[PDB]
Design a protein around this ligand. Structure first.
Ligand SMILES: [Mg+2]
Ligand SMILES: [Zn+2]
Ligand SMILES: [Zn+2]
Ligand SMILES: [Zn+2]
Lengths: 115, 42, 260, 67, 404, 49, 51, 46, 97, 51, 475
RNA sequence: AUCGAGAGGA
């Protein structure tokens, strides 16, 4: 009667975009990234990778409502840096981490199966 | 001869089982209706 | 400001599970990998049923739900198949789904077990795990003499985020800091708690001395496979899918920075 | 009414273990030892086999609608 | 919309809400606004009325909206406060030894709607930067309100001696310029009573700011409780063997004193007190032996509790339960009464066929000397069922006559 | 006729025989079928005579 | 003194920590079946024409 | 057009037109069941 | 008629007749069916607000369940047999006399 | 009290007794509500029962 | 006691102080069986238990136990003259003898409970109102109400997909046949505060478990109809209506019906659809539509269609429609301890908290439901169920059993590598961090109750009105 | 459809 399709949590509706960037006028050099059809899986890793950047002053995320399927990520950086640049570098670092982890897991399987 | 305490806790339940093997749970309904048909109508 | 250099150490590898340790990574990365094991590793599962005849004692949705939960070998085929969202065909085609037939009738007196072995596929690579060449076959329904079940299923690509039938795992054990050194748990009575299998403490000592400067490193995983994929294939798919989500997010991010 | 396919909790397949479980039980295994023989570690899967009531066996005592 | 729950007892049983469309097929309510409706989520249903004109919409917006309904004219005090999980968790959060890491603090600041975007200076900068729970609740607290309260565990002899303004137990809530300077928040500070932080927020700040205050407490504290967690199990119903054996010694006093009194009455050694017959004096004297026993065993169980105990955690926060519940779960369930008296002789001079005739002892007349963890004996079970039936009858019979 | 009573056709039937009439062997009986609707008589308290 | 009314709905209530105190979470089905008569103006002509 | 029914007693295939009293012609049983339709109902195995 | 409607009495005296006898059997779950078949009823009248007939009397021990009772307007008026409780069917006194 | 002392005495005493009933369980009600009830109950020179 | 001229149900009360001997043979006397006691000794010896053990061979039954003078039915009025031993341990010579002149003994005190209260595990560890509320709610729990449900055309019926017998049971359920037609599922319950969606008597369910069939049910609804030929003035008939002859035809399509006017089994039917096409001859000419529609907003599948003749003998049709009910937010669930609550939210397996071995709870209930309610039986059942699942048992939760207390269960649980009190370290599903509090988790028998939100949700905006007063209808 | 009855829910 009122059950949303299970694909709604991860599929995107037409005309609604994956990520939206919004100044935060609160404080300088802060942005809100509203990411649609993602959840804690990406929000947590992006936030923690951003917390590794010493030029990031604030990094946080929230799922505003569990029944809704978007996350907000707030990023504040130092004035010489940009929250968009910080977000990009965090994603790049996560990708490189996962590529390295994948290659090393392949090697570890390789070794386990043959010795 | 005597049921000792160590056996009691299944002696008793054995007894209870026998009761429900004989009577059931709706024995009052069936007995009442049976008495009504065998006696009360006549 | 840059990526971790995680290392991996696989401590057990069977056909049933993989037990490994990731070391020098963040807890968020470890938990996202754990979550992707369960929710974003695609496999093949029956997601469309057509009951042509069902005289069994289980109604049609019961049979359909039961068929959806049978694991299908998805090892090399899942990467090749498309989502039916992405396929340019009609309802079905061999590029986005796999056909199954089942047609059983109990003639003898004596109860017929319609099992996953009766699910006949058009694709030899995608078959029920129990049917793969020990463990018995998954029981779909028991039929009495005169009862009959004839149906036609289609199996599609999906992941556990849509339905648990596309979840390839049969339990993902995840642990870190087996000795409570970070004190992320606070035992009222630490002596009463059993030791972790990964604990490295003498029996007199209940938990490790508190580490003020530590964080979570060295996460222990035991990924058990339901059968559709190998456990190492589950882990490799999980890493690829998590990565590759991050790549899509990056692409959209670049467009959205561009457009401003 | 019939053995579930997956464990409700973890998703381990238990639908191929009911018949083997019963065979082990008539072979004079204890329920725990039988569950150990089938590889059900976790008390969720042990719950699935140990608490199952095979009602389908009773539903098959009725003649079907068509001969 | 107007949102209503029956029975509509007072004006807070119908309040104005703004609609938020959400997926599934239930009416989804905030948890602070459950107390005004007397609503819980065990199958309760509620009614939504949609005003059909701008006239009525403005009327409900300006008169009946929930933030305008925070303080009731019935008892000049808030009608909604902080409730179960948020209250247990804010009690645990504002303890003196709650230290938050940088990432945890940022995670909690994501859930503050009224946040100026400035991360406060941590209370501890070295060897590690650590924020305190009071430091974050200070950000939750609105405006510049000032408030003095006392935590429920505040000792009564602390305000006299030294350490009045530096409390060893972190009781004596002091909020000053909108910062929680000190103290553990609880029902006395965030509940529905008069002079609490929510009341003072409504009086000093408006209803909008107080609405945001409620929402912010709930969101921040719930997302912190995701880290802290709260539970209850068997371990919270256990006491140490010292305590058990103290309680058994107390009960065996109490029975053996009641036997003392029973012989005095049997030998006519007992004289009435003024204003009562000899029966009624004996009954008083036994009931006051057994209430002393129940109170003493309850005290023993209370003092046995740790500050990891979750029963205690929910009782200090005022979220749920009372000390008498802890006593009944751990120490002794106590005397079962029917119509304000001990169990009556429903048989011939007997409460049950398992007792001798004319047995006024504690067992016979419905004293449950066991706890709920120990388990009741069959006679205790029946007498307890009798007392509980009295409660059920009262609940089911008072309604018609109060409603009339 | 009350079901499973002495004058019921299900009286003395085995679990076979009940299933083979499309009856549940675990059905206790004790009720009437009036116009296809299963009716149960509730025992009524009264003050002894 | 009391009567049945149109434009009313009833259903089971559920917790939602992520609503403000003045919010009520409502289903699509109730909201799709309940309506509000909004007057047309040049201020709202376009929006109401989509609806 | 035929609208064949099944007997509740003897499980016999048998055709019955409208305005005909319902009675199986094997065994005279009074209760009959319709056959499963021949349209195509689809189930998502969920 | 009387078993179909539950109005216990002549159909003409449909208001002097006492309803609630002969209820529709609860077939929700097996426990509901068993309990409904072991249900007792105290015709004091739900309107009555005297608690005395609703109290759990000491003499219900072993005869009536101390717990199973509706929590609404009939609390303690609708009762249930204890498991080994058996209601006597009646007998002839002539052998005893 | 009304018969012996009069309408204002019974107004006061009725306030007192209602306050005793309300506050015995530790509860509190704003005095203006009790005052309004007791004034409705005595404004016509006799004891007006709420019936 | 010899089964002589006096039959067993005859009550014989001697009032001694007043010199009456009152003998009762009439009907309606509630009585119960009790073990007779000799000087201080049960008449029930081991020979009786031995013969009872082979009850299926030597046809030594209860009724021989009664005939042996070992058991006696005692009515309420004769209990006033009886001195009962609660257990044979009361007969045992003590340092201070309480009675020393007992006449009867309880077979077992747990027989004071009825059918629904005999389901409760550890009812003597709960507040009594909780036991009453469960005794009420066990009658709304879904299960398999009867084995031959496939042939019954009940107006309403709920059948659970996967009923389970409780892991923690009482010895009375062996006679209630609860093991054979159970009405619930053993769920991995964690009592925790997780996201706030279980506050105030609400539960958080595992979406993945629900996907695997957890507490899934099927709802069967039967529709009657009969075509009446009461007189030549007007006659009804089942037949696919037509737009040209029928007058009161709704705009709903009648294509799902067959020639005979009856829908076929296996046809998916949505709200307001037609399942029986019935037309009544008039005095849009010479026949008016009186078809049977589905009860609105149901959306099931026609399970089966039966046709027969009623008593007077016109056509009579019964159509059973089948609707799968998957648990969702707002569905009511209950344990066996009065702990009821609706589903507040459903999280997937990766969102739920997990143990070191990746066990997620099926249900999460709020700890604030325990303290005021004092349902310690819930906690003891959870702990016993953890022991039973780890041991391969069924736990014994019979009410008054001194061979089972919390300590001995905890000692058993500590032997399986678990914290003895049933607590476990859980990890946050969203972040993977350990929860600072160790959560109490284990198997507990839960019940899905008939009260589903989809049968309760209702809305109105200018619908039908009552004839007398032009006000909205009722219901 | 109306009336009544009963069983339930909060
Ligand atoms: Mg409620
Ligand atoms: Zn395709
Ligand atoms: Zn499992
Ligand atoms: Zn036939």
């Amino acid at each position: 009667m009122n059950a949303p399709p299970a694909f709604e949590s991860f599929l995107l509706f037409e005309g609604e975009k994956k990520i939206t960037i919004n100044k935060d006028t609160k404080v300088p050099n802060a942005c809100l990234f509203t990411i649609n059809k993602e959840d804690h899986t990406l929000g947590n890793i992006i936030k923690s990778q951003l917390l590794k950047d010493p030029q990031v002053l604030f990094a946080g995320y929230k799922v505003p409502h569990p029944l809704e399927h978007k996350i907000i990520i707030r990023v504040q950086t130092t004035p010489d840096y940009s929250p968009q640049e910080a977000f990009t570098n965090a994603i790049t670092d996560l990708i490189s981490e996962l590529s390295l982890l994948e290659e090393r897991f392949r090697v570890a399987i390789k070794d386990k199966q043959e010795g | 001869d005597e049921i000792t305490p160590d056996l009691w806790q299944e002696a008793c339940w054995i007894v209870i089982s026998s009761y429900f093997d004989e009577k059931g749970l709706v024995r009052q309904q069936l007995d009442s209706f049976d008495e009504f048909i065998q006696m009360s109508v006549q | 400001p840059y990526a971790n250099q995680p290392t991996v150490r696989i401590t057990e590898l069977t056909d049933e599970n993989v037990k490994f340790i990731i070391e020098n990574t963040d807890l968020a990365v470890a938990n996202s990998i754990r979550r992707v094991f369960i929710a974003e590793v695609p496999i093949i599962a029956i997601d469309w049923v057509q009951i042509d005849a069902n005289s069994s004692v289980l109604h049609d949705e019961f049979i359909a739900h039961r068929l959806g939960l049978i694991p299908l070998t998805s090892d090399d085929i899942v990467d090749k198949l498309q989502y039916s969202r992405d396929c340019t065909c009609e309802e079905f085609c061999p590029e986005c789904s796999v056909e199954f037939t089942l047609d059983v009738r109990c003639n003898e007196d004596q109860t017929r077990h319609v099992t996953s072995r009766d699910l006949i596929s058009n694709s030899p690579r995608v078959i029920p795990v129990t049917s793969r060449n020990e463990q018995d076959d998954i029981l779909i329904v028991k039929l009495r003499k005169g009862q009959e079940l004839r149906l036609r299923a289609y199996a599609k690509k999906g992941f556990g985020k849509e339905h648990a039938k596309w979840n390839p795992t049969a339990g993902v054990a995840f642990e870190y800091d087996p000795d409570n050194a970070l004190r992320h748990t606070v035992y009222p009575k630490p002596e009463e708690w059993p030791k972790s299998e990964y604990s490295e403490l003498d029996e007199d000592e209940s938990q490790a001395p508190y580490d003020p400067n530590g964080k979570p490193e060295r996460f222990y995983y035991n990924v058990e496979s339901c059968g559709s994929l190998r456990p190492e294939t589950i882990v490799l798919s999980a890493l690829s899918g998590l990565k590759k989500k991050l790549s899509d997010l990056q692409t959209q991010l670049s467009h959205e920075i561009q457009s401003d | 009414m019939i053995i579930p396919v997956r464990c409700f909790t973890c998703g381990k397949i238990v639908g191929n273990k009911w018949e083997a479980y019963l065979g082990l039980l008539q072979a004079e295994y204890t329920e725990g030892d039988a569950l150990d023989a089938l590889g059900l570690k976790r008390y969720c899967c042990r719950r699935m086999l140990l608490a199952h009531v095979d009602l389908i066996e009773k539903l098959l005592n009725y003649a079907p609608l068509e001969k | 919309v107007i949102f209503n729950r029956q029975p509509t007892l007072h004006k807070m049983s119908m309040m104005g809400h703004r609609v938020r469309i959400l997926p599934w097929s239930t009416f989804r309510l905030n948890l602070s606004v459950t107390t005004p409706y007397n609503a819980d989520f065990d199958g309760d249903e509620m009614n939504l009325h949609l005003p059909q004109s701008l006239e009525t919409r403005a009327e409900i917006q300006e008169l009946a909206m929930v933030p305008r309904m925070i303080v009731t004219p019935q008892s000049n005090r808030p009608v909604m406060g902080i409730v179960q999980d948020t209250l247990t968790a804010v009690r645990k959060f504002t303890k003196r030894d709650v230290f938050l890491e940088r990432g945890e603090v940022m995670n909690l600041l994501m859930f503050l709607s009224t946040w100026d975007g400035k991360v406060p200076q941590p209370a501890i900068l070295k060897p590690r930067p650590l924020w305190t729970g009071k430091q974050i609740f200070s950000l939750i607290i609105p405006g510049h309100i000032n408030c003095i309260r006392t935590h429920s565990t505040h000792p009564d002899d602390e305000d006299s001696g030294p350490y009045k303004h530096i409390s060893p137990g972190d009781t004596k809530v002091v909020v000053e310029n909108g910062e929680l300077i000190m103290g553990i928040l609880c029902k006395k500070s965030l509940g529905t009573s008069a002079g609490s932080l929510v009341h003072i927020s409504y009086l000093e700040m408006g209803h909008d700011i107080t609405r945001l205050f409620y929402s912010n407490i709930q969101t921040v504290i719930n997302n912190w409780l995701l880290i802290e967690g709260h539970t209850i199990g068997i371990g919270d119903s256990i006491a140490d063997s010292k305590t058990y054996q103290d309680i058994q010694n107390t009960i065996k006093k109490a029975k053996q004193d009641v036997i003392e009194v029973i012989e005095k009455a049997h030998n006519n050694e007992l004289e009435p007190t003024p204003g009562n017959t000899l029966r009624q004096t004996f009954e008083n004297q036994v009931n006051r032996i057994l209430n002393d026993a129940r109170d003493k065993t309850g005290s023993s169980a209370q003092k046995s509790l740790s500050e990891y105990n979750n029963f205690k955690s929910m009782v200090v926060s005022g979220a749920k339960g009372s000390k008498i519940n802890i006593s009944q779960v751990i120490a002794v369930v106590g005397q079962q009464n029917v119509e304000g008296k001990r169990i009556p002789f429903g048989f011939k001079h007997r409460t049950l066929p398992h007792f001798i005739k004319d047995d006024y002892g504690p067992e016979s007349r419905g004293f449950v000397e066991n706890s709920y963890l120990a388990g009741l004996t069959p006679t205790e079970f029946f007498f307890h069922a009798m007392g509980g039936r009295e409660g059920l009858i009262d609940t089911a019979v008072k309604t018609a006559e109060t409603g009339y | 006729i009350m079901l499973r009573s002495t004058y019921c056709l299900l009286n003395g039937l085995t679990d076979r025989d009940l299933c083979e009439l499309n009856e549940c062997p675990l059905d206790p009986g004790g009720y009437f079928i009036i116009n296809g609707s299963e009716k149960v008589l509730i025992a009524q308290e009264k003050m002894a005579t | 003194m009391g009567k049945r009314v149109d434009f009313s709905a009833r259903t089971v209530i559920t917790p939602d920590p992520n609503l403000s105190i003045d919010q009520v979470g409502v289903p699509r089905s109730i909201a799709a079946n309940m309506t509000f008569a909004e007057i047309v103006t040049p201020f709202n002509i376009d929006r109401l024409q989509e609806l | 057009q035929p609208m064949i029914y099944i007997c509740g007693e003897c499980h016999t295939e048998n055709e019955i037109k409208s305005r005909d009293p319902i009675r199986c012609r094997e065994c005279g049983y009074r209760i009959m069941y319709k056959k499963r339709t021949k349209r195509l109902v689809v189930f998502d195995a969920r | 008629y009387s078993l179909a409607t539950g109005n216990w009495g002549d159909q003409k005296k449909a208001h002097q007749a006492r309803a609630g006898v002969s209820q529709v059997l609860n077939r929700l779950t097996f426990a509901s069916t068993l309990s409904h078949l072991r249900r007792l009823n105290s015709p004091i009248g739900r309107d009555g607000k005297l608690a005395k007939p609703r109290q759990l009397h000491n003499t219900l021990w072993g005869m009536v369940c101390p717990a199973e009772t509706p929590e609404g307007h009939a609390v303690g008026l609708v009762k249930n047999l204890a498991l080994m409780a058996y209601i006597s069917v009646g007998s002839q006194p002539s052998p005893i006399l | 009290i009304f018969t012996v002392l009069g309408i204002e005495a019974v107004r006061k005493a009725l306030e007192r007794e209602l306050y005793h009933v309300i506050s015995f369980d530790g509860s509190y009600v704003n005095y203006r509500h009790l005052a309004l009830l007791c004034d409705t109950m005595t404004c016509r020179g006799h004891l007006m029962a709420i019936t | 006691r010899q089964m002589d001229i006096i039959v067993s149900e005859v009550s014989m009360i001697r009032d001694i102080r007043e010199r009456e001997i009152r003998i009762y043979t009439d009907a309606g006397r509630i009585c119960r069986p009790l073990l007779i006691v000799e000087k201080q000794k049960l008449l029930l010896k081991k020979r009786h238990i031995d013969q009872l053990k082979e009850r299926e061979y030597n046809n030594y039954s209860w009724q021989d136990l009664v005939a042996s003078g070992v058991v006696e039915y005692i009515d309420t009025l004769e209990e006033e003259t009886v001195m009962l031993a609660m257990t044979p341990d009361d007969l045992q010579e003590k340092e201070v003898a309480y009675c020393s002149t007992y006449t009867h003994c309880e077979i077992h005190p747990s027989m004071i409970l009825g059918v629904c209260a005999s389901i409760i595990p550890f009812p003597d560890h709960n507040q009594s109102p909780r036991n009453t509320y469960q005794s009420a709610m066990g009658k709304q729990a879904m299960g398999v109400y009867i084995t031959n449900f496939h042939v019954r055309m009940d107006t309403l019926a709920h059948v659970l997909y996967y009923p389970q017998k409780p892991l923690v049971t009482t010895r009375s359920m062996e006679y209630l046949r609860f093991r054979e037609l159970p009405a619930g599922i053993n769920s991995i319950v964690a009592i925790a505060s997780y996201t706030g969606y279980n506050q105030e008597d609400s539960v958080i369910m595992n979406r993945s478990a629900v996907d695997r069939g957890f507490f899934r049910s099927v709802f069967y609804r039967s529709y009657k109809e009969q075509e009446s030929k009461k007189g030549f003035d007007q006659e009804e008939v089942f037949e696919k209506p037509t737009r040209e002859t029928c007058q009161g035809m709704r705009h709903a399509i009648y294509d799902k019906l067959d020639d005979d006017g009856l829908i076929a089994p296996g046809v998916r039917v949505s709200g307001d659809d037609v399942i029986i096409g019935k037309t009544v001859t008039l005095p849009r000419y010479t026949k008016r539509d009186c078809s049977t529609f589905l009860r609105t907003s149901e959306t099931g599948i026609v399970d089966q269609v039966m046709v027969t003749l009623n008593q007077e003998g016109y056509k009579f049709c019964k159509i059973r429609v089948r609707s799968v009910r998957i648990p969702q937010i707002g569905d009511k669930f209950a344990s066996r301890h009065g702990q009821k609550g609706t589903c507040g939210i459903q999280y997937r397996q990766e969102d739920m908290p997990f143990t070191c071995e990746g066990i997620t709870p099926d249900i999460i209930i709020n700890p604030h439901a325990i303290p005021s309610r004092m349902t310690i039986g819930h906690l003891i059942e959870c702990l016993q169920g953890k022991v039973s699942a780890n041991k391969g048992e069924i736990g014994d939760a019979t009410p008054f059993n001194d061979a089972v207390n919390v300590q001995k269960i905890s000692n058993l649980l500590s032997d399986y590598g678990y914290h003895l009190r049933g607590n476990e370290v859980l990890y946050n599903g969203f972040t993977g961090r350990k929860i600072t509090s160790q959560i109490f988790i284990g198997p507990t028998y839960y019940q899905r109750l008939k009260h589903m939100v989809d049968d309760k949700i209702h809305s109105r905006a200018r619908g039908p009105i009552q004839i007398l007063n032009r006000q909205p209808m009722e219901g």
